[PDB]
């Protein structure tokens, strides 16, 4: 049975395209893509449209890793369609479990994806006013959790 995975922060730019492209490098270089659906969204307004901001996408390049996404908002039926949602940090945990309460049949398990590092650092923080090594430290973040993410539950 096919699962399926969304991850979130506040803007869909920086740190959830980079989990996003992370995680499906994993399960393709595993050869299980066709027994996964994977996507990102935005908690925020701010970016609705925009491609990847150029340091996630010269940081996910120097990994091999590309990405075609555009930032999207999430929606109540996001709620109803993912098995996990995977968000960044509290704020984000707090507004998307804020928004899960008005929806009726809500499915998704809503988690801090850092609640999966082996290393136990619980927070991904938003890089948007920092620089190029910031985003690597997310990049690394992204690997370590993702990767105990998918031992757990493929
Ligand atoms: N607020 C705060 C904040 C506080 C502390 C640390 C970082 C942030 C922070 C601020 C941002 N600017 C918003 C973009 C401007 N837009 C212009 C178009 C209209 C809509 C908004 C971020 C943008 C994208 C991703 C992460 C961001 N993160
Ligand atoms: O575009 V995000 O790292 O809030």
């Not at 659906?37 to 996630?56: H, K, L, Q």
């Not at 850092?114 to 910031?134: M, R, V």
């Amino acid at each position: 049975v096919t699962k399926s995975v969304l991850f979130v922060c506040l803007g869909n730019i920086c740190r959830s395209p980079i989990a996003e492209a992370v995680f499906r490098k994993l399960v393709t270089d595993q050869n299980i893509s066709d027994n996964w659906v994977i996507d990102s969204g935005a908690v925020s307004d701010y970016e609705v449209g925009r491609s990847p901001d150029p340091r996630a996408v010269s940081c996910l390049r120097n990994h091999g890793i590309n990405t075609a996404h555009k930032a999207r908002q999430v929606t109540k039926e996001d709620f109803v369609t993912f098995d996990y949602i995977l968000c960044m940090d509290e704020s984000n945990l707090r507004d998307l479990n804020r928004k899960s309460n008005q929806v009726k049949n809500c499915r998704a398990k809503i988690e801090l994806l850092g609640s999966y590092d082996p290393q136990k650092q619980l927070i991904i923080e938003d890089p948007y006013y920092g620089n190029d090594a910031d985003f690597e430290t997310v990049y690394q973040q992204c690997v370590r959790c993702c990767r105990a993410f998918l031992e757990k539950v493929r």
